[PDB]
Amino acid sequence: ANALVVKVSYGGVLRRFRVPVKANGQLDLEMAGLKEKIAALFNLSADAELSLTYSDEDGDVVALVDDNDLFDVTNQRLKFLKINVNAG
């Protein structure tokens, strides 16, 4: 019945917000729902490209591209997700 704490950080200011999950177990948003949510925090122009890369369990710098890999963050069993923004 619990959320995933997501911390993002662009222009060297870390932020943090939470995202709930269903009863079923998947995250209750998608990338188009996510990337326009990040553009709210940072006052970025939404037409700009975002290059979002999270952290794996065993420390790789993975890419995010699709709602297929957002499913994987639940099964990855991470304590809090961290997503870096690279624009322009």
Numbering used by the authors: 5 to 92
What text appears in the publication on this structure?
PB1 domains are protein interaction modules with critical roles in the assembly of protein complexes involved in autophagy, signaling, cell division, and redox processes, as well as the auxin-response pathway in plants. PB1 domains form homotypic interactions via conserved electrostatic motifs molded by basic or acidic surface patches on opposite faces of their ubiquitin-like β-grasp fold. While type A and type B PB1 domains can form heterodimeric protein complexes, type AB members can mediate interactions with either PB1 domain type or engage in homotypic interactions to form homo-oligomers or hetero-oligomers. Our cryo-EM structures of filamentous p62 and AtNBR1–PB1 assemblies revealed that the presence of a tandem arginine sequence in the basic motif of type AB interfaces is required to stabilize a polymeric assembly.
Of the three PB1 assemblies studied, AtNBR11–94 (AtNBR1–PB1) and p621–122 (p62-PB1) formed homogeneous filaments of constant diameter that appeared best suited for high-resolution structure investigation by cryo-EM. Image classification of segmented PB1 helices revealed that both AtNBR1–PB1 and p62-PB1 polymerize in two different tubular morphologies: a projection class with a ladder-like pattern, we term L-type, and a projection class with a serpent-like one, we term S-type. By indexing the layer lines in the Fourier spectra of AtNBR1–PB1 filaments, we concluded that L-type is a two-stranded helix with a pitch of 77.2 Å and 11.47 subunits/turn, whereas S-type is a single double-stranded helix with a pitch of 68.2 Å and 11.55 subunits/turn. Using the derived symmetries, we determined the 3.5/3.9- (L-type, p62/AtNBR1) and 4.0/4.4 Å- (S-type, p62/AtNBR1) resolution structures. All four structures form tubules of ~120 Å and 150-Å width with an inner diameter of 45 Å and 70 Å for AtNBR1–PB1 and p62-PB1, respectively. In the absence of prior structural information, we traced the AtNBR1–PB1 de novo. This de novo-built model is in close agreement with the 1.6-Å crystal structure of a polymerization-deficient AtNBR1–PB1 mutant, which we solved in parallel. The main interactions are formed between a double arginine finger formed by two neighboring arginine residues in strand β2 (R19–R20AtNBR1/R21–22p62) stabilizing strong salt bridges to acidic residues (D60/D62/D64/D73AtNBR1 or D69/D71/D73/E82p62) in the OPCA motif located in the β2–β3 loop and the α2 helix. These interactions are assisted by the canonical-type B lysine (K11AtNBR1 and K7p62) in strand β1. In addition to the canonical transverse interactions, the helices are further stabilized by longitudinal interactions Y14AtNBR1/N28AtNBR1 or K102p62/D92p62 and R59p62/D93p62 to subunits of neighboring strands along the helical axis.
